[PDB]
Amino acid sequence: SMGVFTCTLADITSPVAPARLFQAFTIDNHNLMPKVVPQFVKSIDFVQGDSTAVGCVKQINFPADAPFTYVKNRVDEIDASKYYLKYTCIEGDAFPDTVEYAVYEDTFEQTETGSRCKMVAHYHLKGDSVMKEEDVAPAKEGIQKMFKAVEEHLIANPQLYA
Numbered sequence: 001s002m003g004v005f006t007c008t009l010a011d012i013t014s015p016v017a018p019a020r021l022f023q024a025f026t027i028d029n030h031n032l033m034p035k036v037v038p039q040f041v042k043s044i045d046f047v048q049g050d051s052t053a054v055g056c057v058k059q060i061n062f063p064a065d066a067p068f069t070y071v072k073n074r075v076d077e078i079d080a081s082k083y084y085l086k087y088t089c090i091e092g093d094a095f096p097d098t099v100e101y102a103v104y105e106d107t108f109e110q111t112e113t114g115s116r117c118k119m120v121a122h123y124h125l126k127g128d129s130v131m132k133e134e135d136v137a138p139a140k141e142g143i144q145k146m147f148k149a150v151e152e153h154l155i156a157n158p159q160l161y162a
């Protein structure tokens with residue numbers, strides 16, 4: 001309608017190897033996140049499929065603390081060799097009134113320090129949808145805290161996903 005707003009929701013350099021972060025955040029997150037970050041993720045259930053694969057749909061349920069309750073993410077592309085996953089949010093109440101359609105790319109890049117993790121969002125905006133930094137700042141701050149906890153978990157458990 002009005003256009004597309006592409007923004008980097010997270011850009012995080014980490015000493016942890018990219019293959020381990022990729023597994024933690026995009027492949028095995030339905031197991032890891034409710035345990036390691038339960039203050040951000042209540043549960044993650046498969047509503048289509050039973051493993052992270054192209055075509056599966058995961059429902060992420062947020063704690064009662066949260067200002068919303070759930071999203072459903074449909075996985076559309078995986079390139080594990082490049083630590084890349086693209087998914088589309090097809091349903092949920094985490095949507096601002098401004099966003100008609102949301103597409104996400106999780107990418108992990110090998111560096112010298114370790115990894116660089118980028119999470120990019122593509123927001124298709126409704127008819128004249130004003131979008132402000134304040135609309136994405138809580139996502140940015142929440143993702144950084146979640147990454148912090150997951151990073152520490154992988155440091156404390158060096159063989160997990162290794």
Ligand SMILES: C/C(=C/CNc1ncnc2c1ncn2[C@@H]1O[C@H](CO)[C@@H](O)[C@H]1O)CO
Pocket residue numbers: 009067094104105106119120135136137138139140142143146
């Ligand atoms: C109202 C409001 C709510 C807060 N939003 C979010 N909080 C946490 N993670 C999010 C969010 N949106 C998209 N993600 C993707 O979740 C995966 C795991 O992190 C990554 O792909 C992230 O890119 C602020 O705008």
